Amino acid sequence: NLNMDLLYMAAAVMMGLAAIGAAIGIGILGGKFLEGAARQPDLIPLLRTQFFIVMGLVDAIPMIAVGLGLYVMFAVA
Amino acid sequence: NLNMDLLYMAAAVMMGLAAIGAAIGIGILGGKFLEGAARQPDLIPLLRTQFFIVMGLVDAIPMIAVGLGLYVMFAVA
Amino acid sequence: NLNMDLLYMAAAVMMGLAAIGAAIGIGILGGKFLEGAARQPDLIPLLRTQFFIVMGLVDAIPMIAVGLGLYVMFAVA
Amino acid sequence: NLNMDLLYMAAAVMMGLAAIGAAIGIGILGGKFLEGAARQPDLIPLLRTQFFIVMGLVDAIPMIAVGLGLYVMFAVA
Amino acid sequence: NLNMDLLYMAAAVMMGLAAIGAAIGIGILGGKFLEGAARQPDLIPLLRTQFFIVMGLVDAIPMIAVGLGLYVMFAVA
Amino acid sequence: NLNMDLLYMAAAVMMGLAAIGAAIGIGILGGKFLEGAARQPDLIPLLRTQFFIVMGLVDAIPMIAVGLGLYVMFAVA
Amino acid sequence: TYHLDVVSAEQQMFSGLVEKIQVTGSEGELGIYPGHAPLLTAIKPGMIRIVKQHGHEEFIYLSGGILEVQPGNVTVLADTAIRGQDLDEARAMEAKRKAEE
Amino acid sequence: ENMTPQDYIGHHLNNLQLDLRTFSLVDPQNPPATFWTINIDSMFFSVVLGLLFLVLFRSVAKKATSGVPGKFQTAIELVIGFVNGSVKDMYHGKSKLIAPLALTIFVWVFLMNLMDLLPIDLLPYIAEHVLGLPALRVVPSADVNVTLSMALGVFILILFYSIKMKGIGGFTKELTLQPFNHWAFIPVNLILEGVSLLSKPVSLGLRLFGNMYAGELIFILIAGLLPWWSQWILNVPWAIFHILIITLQAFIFMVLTIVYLSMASE
Amino acid sequence: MNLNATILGQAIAFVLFVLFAMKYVWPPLMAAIEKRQKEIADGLASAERAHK
Amino acid sequence: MNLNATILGQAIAFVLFVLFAMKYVWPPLMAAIEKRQKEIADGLASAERAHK
């Protein structure tokens, strides 16, 4: 039956959106991090820790979406 | 055919839009947080607590979509 | 049957749009709040109150949109 | 079968667009209001009162959009 | 007669796009208006007149779109 | 026959979204890095190191997306 | 071209018409050209270097000060020292103890 | 063994529901459609955690002296100081209820979330084989009900504070007039205030449930899909993240409850 | 997922825990550290009064 | 699928996570040690100072 094709499309949309968000938000955050590290070059180890702290919060939902897309693509289809 | 794959596509829409919104909003918030921390490297706990307040407020509503998408995928479909 | 099945997609679209709008708006608002609290640390409880005041205004339309999507996906579907 | 279903679909897209617009506009307006509050905290009682008037103009149109969406969902069915 | 159902979707898309455009434009204008009122609080009644003059232009196309969508929704359908 | 044809669109959307996300995120990060290098030409070797540290996080998800798009285009076809 | 002044509270250090200058601004190195928009910034200690009319090179070391720009005028309000350490608070103590003793 | 990963995931997302009427163990293969079937697994682990919290806090409170502090007492004194400092930061009233409520919320929510770090199959395998229970899932927080019951209790407390400290007159006044204060907007004001008021606790409960549920399902997928030799390279980076996640989420629940109660009262 | 009457039993458990903790748990704690601070402060105050 | 292999892999991953937590999440007790040192030293020294 033809039903199998649509699962690939749904996984494609979900993972593409997840990658769009995971790239853009991390890019903005890293740009601010670099801007702040340029000013105070001695504070890099602290800003770098806080950057990781917030970056963990950023990508979580994209990670969920990517994992679900992998599941839909391989296990279901 | 029409039953399962449309549900999968709906879940994919939910959890792509939720990932987009949450990632972009958290990146925006974290940019201002990291900018503040470079200006006042001492006040970091207070600013990060306020950031936690706002981060919870942001994250609250996309998680509705995330959980409902998981429900639609597994319980319904 | 297709009639009820598509309702899930309609609710998915509605609540995904609601989530993206709310997440982005609240992220911008919280970023401005964080920057303000970083300029004037002694002022934080006032700005936080103002932020809650305006956040109660922001979320109302996304909140009702998500509630109506939940209605269409549970009571209707 | 698909008449009421498409009615719900049209209501869904309408209300999603309305929620997106309202959330983004109020986010921008509240962010600028927060910045103006931050600059001169003692002026907040006036700036808040002007922000309320402007936010009423912001809210004017998404509310007729949402009202027509509710009409489509409930009355037309 | 399937003719009726597509007209509701055609009205819905028009009104949603009009709501998005008008709400984001009015928020952008009002944000600068509020920041200017924050800077020079004595000039507020003049800036309000200027803001109304400009707002009369922002809503030119959006109000035509909303009127035409409302016309399509009731008179034509 | 649709099982073969639709897979190319499912890969096309993935490899468009991944490219848009990676391009926007890398553009914003590179712009911030360029501004920091312009202001502080002495720190260029340090800012470049931190830029390459951060950039490997942006590409994490879009490279999964592009690899899965290549897989969908070629292996399953 | 513009007329560059270099002055301090004690003395006029330099005055003359200048085609371009290199100066270390508060946030980074800065170059000034004729017709530059009005600008105000402190300057960190270091060399400010000058080309007078006909592009003659001149170098001046400054402990610090404030640089500002006006239509056709550039004025450097240099000061004697960084002053950021504030060691003279110790100098104020002996004035008190010797008054008490 | 022979199993489809889809069904392995299916079992784990099921609960030892038991009929309150007939006292009968529901099974994961066929769910009945009767409302009163308590989901036992989350509640059984949930009150156990509260009992452990109460036992430890009493076991330290029963002996603590102002002399040389012990190594064990120091953690409890630190958590008491942290909760008290947060309350004093965001609450100025005389109500003795707020601080112990926040302390209980923080500790209990932290304990519930911690269950997710454990191996997903350990306790369920034990319960199925040694005991014989049809189903089990051991993270209480992943239950929507535990989250929604706590959020609705907090909302009830908010209503009580609005009626008592803020006042019923001061509640009708705010609902009708604010934020636009004009009678033309009063019908709109009522709707906006009600929507935001109901949005707050729903946001708390569904945020917590979403976090715990989307961590538990990630662990279940990692266990079910990947071969044993490869599981660690994706499981370990996730538990480290989820430790910060559970700490942050318990902190968020406590602080947001404090904020809502303080805004209702004062 | 699926709502159930578990919503009620946990509402009983929550209120019971809240009542028991509010009564017994909190009041004994936080006394010792306050006693330490008061001892340090009053010893300082008394010593400075005798110094004056 | 074999269920034994899943239990083996989950055990492996939990062992590795326990090791990582013990060597990177446990140390905050070291931060907690400073509180003990401060409390003991300040209390004893301040009481002695007041009595003297």
Author numbering:
A (entry chain O), B (entry chain P), C (entry chain I), D (entry chain Q), E (entry chain L), F (entry chain N): 3 to 79
G (entry chain H): 3 to 103
H (entry chain a): 4 to 269
I (entry chain X), J (entry chain Y): 1 to 52
Publication text:
A key component in the generation of cellular energy is the F1Fo ATP synthase, a biological rotary motor that converts proton motive force (pmf) to adenosine tri-phosphate (ATP) in both oxidative phosphorylation and photophosphorylation. The enzyme is based on two rotary motors, termed F1 and Fo, that are coupled together by two stalks: a central rotor stalk and a peripheral stator stalk.
Masked 3D classification focusing on the central rotor highlighted sub-states in which the εCTD adopted either a condensed down conformation or an extended half-up conformation. However, due to the likely high flexibility of this sample, it was still difficult to unequivocally assign the position of the membrane domain subunits (a, b, and c subunits) in the maps. To obtain clearer information in this region, a refinement that focused on the Fo motor was performed and produced maps of sufficient detail to enable fitting of the membrane region. In the half up sub-states, no density for εCTH2 was observed, however εCTH1 remained attached to subunit γ. In the present study we observe that the Fo motor rotates two c subunit steps in the clockwise direction (when viewed from the membrane, i.e. the synthesis direction) when the εCTD transitions from the half-up to the down conformation. Torsional flexing of the central stalk facilitates the majority of this Fo rotation, while the peripheral stalk flexes to accommodate the remainder. When the εCTD is in the up or half-up conformation, the εCTH1 binds to the γ subunit, clamping the central rotor together. This clamping would stabilize the central stalk in a closed position, increasing the stiffness of the rotor which, in turn, has the potential to impede enzyme turnover by decreasing the flexibility of the intact enzyme.
